[PDB]
Amino acid sequence: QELNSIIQRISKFDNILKDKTIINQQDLRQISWNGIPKIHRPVVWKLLIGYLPVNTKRQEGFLQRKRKEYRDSLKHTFSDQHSRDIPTWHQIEIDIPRTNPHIPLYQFKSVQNSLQRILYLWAIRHPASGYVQGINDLVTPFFETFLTEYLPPSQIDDVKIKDPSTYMVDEQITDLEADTFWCLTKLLEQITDNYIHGQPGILRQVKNLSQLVKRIDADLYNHFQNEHVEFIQFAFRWMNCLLMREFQMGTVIRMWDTYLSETSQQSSLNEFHVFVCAAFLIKWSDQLMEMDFQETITFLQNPPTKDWTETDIEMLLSEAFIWQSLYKDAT
Amino acid sequence: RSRIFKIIVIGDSNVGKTCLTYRFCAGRFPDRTEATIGVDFRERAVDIDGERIKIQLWDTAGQERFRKSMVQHYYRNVHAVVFVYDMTNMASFHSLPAWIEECKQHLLANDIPRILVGNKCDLRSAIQVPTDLAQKFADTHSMPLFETSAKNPNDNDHVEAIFMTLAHKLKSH
Ligand SMILES: Nc1nc2c(ncn2[C@@H]2O[C@H](COP(=O)(O)OP(=O)(O)O)[C@@H](O)[C@H]2O)c(=O)[nH]1
Numbered sequence: 001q002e003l004n005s006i007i008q009r010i011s012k013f014d015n016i017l018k019d020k021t022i023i024n025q026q027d028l029r030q031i032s033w034n035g036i037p038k039i040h041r042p043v044v045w046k047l048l049i050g051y052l053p054v055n056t057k058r059q060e061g062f063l064q065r066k067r068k069e070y071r072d073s074l075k076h077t078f079s080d081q082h083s084r085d086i087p088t089w090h091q092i093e094i095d096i097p098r099t100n101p102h103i104p105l106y107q108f109k110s111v112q113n114s115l116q117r118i119l120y121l122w123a124i125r126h127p128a129s130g131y132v133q134g135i136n137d138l139v140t141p142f143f144e145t146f147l148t149e150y151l152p153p154s155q156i157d158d159v160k161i162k163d164p165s166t167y168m169v170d171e172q173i174t175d176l177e178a179d180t181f182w183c184l185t186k187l188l189e190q191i192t193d194n195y196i197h198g199q200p201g202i203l204r205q206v207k208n209l210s211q212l213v214k215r216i217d218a219d220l221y222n223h224f225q226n227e228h229v230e231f232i233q234f235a236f237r238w239m240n241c242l243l244m245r246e247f248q249m250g251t252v253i254r255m256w257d258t259y260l261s262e263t264s265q266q267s268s269l270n271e272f273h274v275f276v277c278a279a280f281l282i283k284w285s286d287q288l289m290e291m292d293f294q295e296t297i298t299f300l301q302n303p304p305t306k307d308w309t310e311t312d313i314e315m316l317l318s319e320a321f322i323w324q325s326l327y328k329d330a331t
Numbered sequence: 332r333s334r335i336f337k338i339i340v341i342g343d344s345n346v347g348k349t350c351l352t353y354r355f356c357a358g359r360f361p362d363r364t365e366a367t368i369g370v371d372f373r374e375r376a377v378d379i380d381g382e383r384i385k386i387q388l389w390d391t392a393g394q395e396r397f398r399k400s401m402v403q404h405y406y407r408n409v410h411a412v413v414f415v416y417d418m419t420n421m422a423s424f425h426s427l428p429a430w431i432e433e434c435k436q437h438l439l440a441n442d443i444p445r446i447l448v449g450n451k452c453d454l455r456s457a458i459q460v461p462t463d464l465a466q467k468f469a470d471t472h473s474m475p476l477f478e479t480s481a482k483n484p485n486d487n488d489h490v491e492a493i494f495m496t497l498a499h500k501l502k503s504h
């Protein structure tokens with residue numbers, strides 16, 4: 001279809017991705033900023049985040065080396081060469097069954113064991129933060145998205161309900177775990193200071209957000225002062241889990257098409273995320289202006305986003321982007 | 332104008348602070364919690380002797396990282412503390428002197444009601460923390476001990492009773 005919108009967008013992505021020698025990264029960024037067809041997300045996300053080589057002939061040998069390195073790290077980790085860090089192993093253990101509790105995928109034992117490996121290897125390789133709660137959330141958009149590559153297009157929508165074991169052999173699961181591990185590593189390198197002792201990364205971001213909202217919406221800011229609403233009472237979770245806890249997984253996945261294009265190595269993740277949060281907060285300004293302290297905190301910890309479409313999130317992202325430009329000369 | 336009282340629930344990750352506070356607030360046990368990130372806010376209106384009071388419950392994240400990061404500046408203007416440990420986990424009981432020390436040195440009051448709640452007593456075979464050990468501890472810090480289950484349906488009127496105890500205290504200046 002030239003008149004069918006999803007078919008035409010897929011076609012434009014094929015033109016950039018398919019039958020090329022070197023995939024043009026700037027062309028892929030421009031298009032992806034505006035949403036990535038679900039058929040294309042696993043490959044595009046990997047390219048954008050800097051994991052998968054843009055030179056297509058390098059790709060097979062690269063992944064082979066990265067997937068074997070992850071296997072060698074598993075082998076070393078579960079052997080007498082590694083003394084298990086029990087507090088870390090245990091904190092991840094007790095977070096996993098509490099990760100995305102209302103998505104059936106996450107209660108499969110196979111999925112839980114995958115996430116345990118990814119998160120524990122990440123944590124023992126990053127001793128300045130260790131594992132910090134909320135990083136279990138951040139691994140899952142990559143995990144679930146990368147799984148969809150292993151599904152026929154017509155079952156991509158069932159990814160939340162099928163046990164990976166029923167359509168992937170163990171070796172494929174290990175391959176997906178590697179990719180998830182290396183891509184989670186690239187994400188977290190963008191925001192290191194967020195999870196070290198004291199979480200200064202988050203505290204800076206919340207201050208930056210306070211000051212942005214004072215500038216862009218002074219009335220909302222003054223109302224918050226009048227009611228003793230502190231930004232930290234709702235925005236700490238916004239930074240720690242990158243808004244994952246305020247949206248449905250489908251909205252998060254779509255928003256990450258844009259985060260990965262925006263930050264593909266052009267803005268930093270920390271900076272763009274604060275603009276997003278300012279745009280998200282100001283979206284509710286009207287309802288919020290009439291609210292007392294308990295109403296504000298309850299609402300901003302349970303925002304009404306369950307029915308948001310890709311177009312709801314697109315409008316938020318484009319407003320963040322515009323503000324990022326407009327309200328740039330502001331420290 | 333109702334009087335509003337701020338109560339914070341503190342203790343190690345996974346001991347059941349969110350389940351307990353869900354009982355305080357909704358008489359229900361949430362069987363699919365997420366790991367709490369930051370500090371969850373919940374309100375309960377209580378009528379006591381013809382006065383309507385508002386109980387604001389701050390359910391905290393219990394990982395050390397967050398503790399030493401920010402829990403400290405959710406300690407302002409608090410009216411009562413619920414300390415929580417998991418009766419099946421001795422370590423969670425052993426973190427309690429550090430939680431207490433954290434309260435003292437990040438605060439401006441000592442005569443505030445506090446309680447100590449040992450949770451998960453339905454795991455009868457797995458209980459590691461004998462009552463006598465916990466009572467001595469509670470006695471030392473001059474606060475009442477309750478051993479209970481947020482999950483056991485046979486206990487929920489009891490949990491409601493534990494929560495009314497602190498409501499009553501607060502209401503009496
Ligand atoms: N058996 C049992 N499990 C409980 C009880 N209270 C909480 N839990 C469980 O312990 C785990 C952690 O609970 P949660 O409230 O999220 O821990 P938190 O980190 O302190 O908030 C969850 O799986 C809960 O279902 C209880 O009284 N009995």
Ligand SMILES: [Mg+2]
Pocket residue numbers: 348349350364365366367390391392
């Ligand atoms: Mg909790």
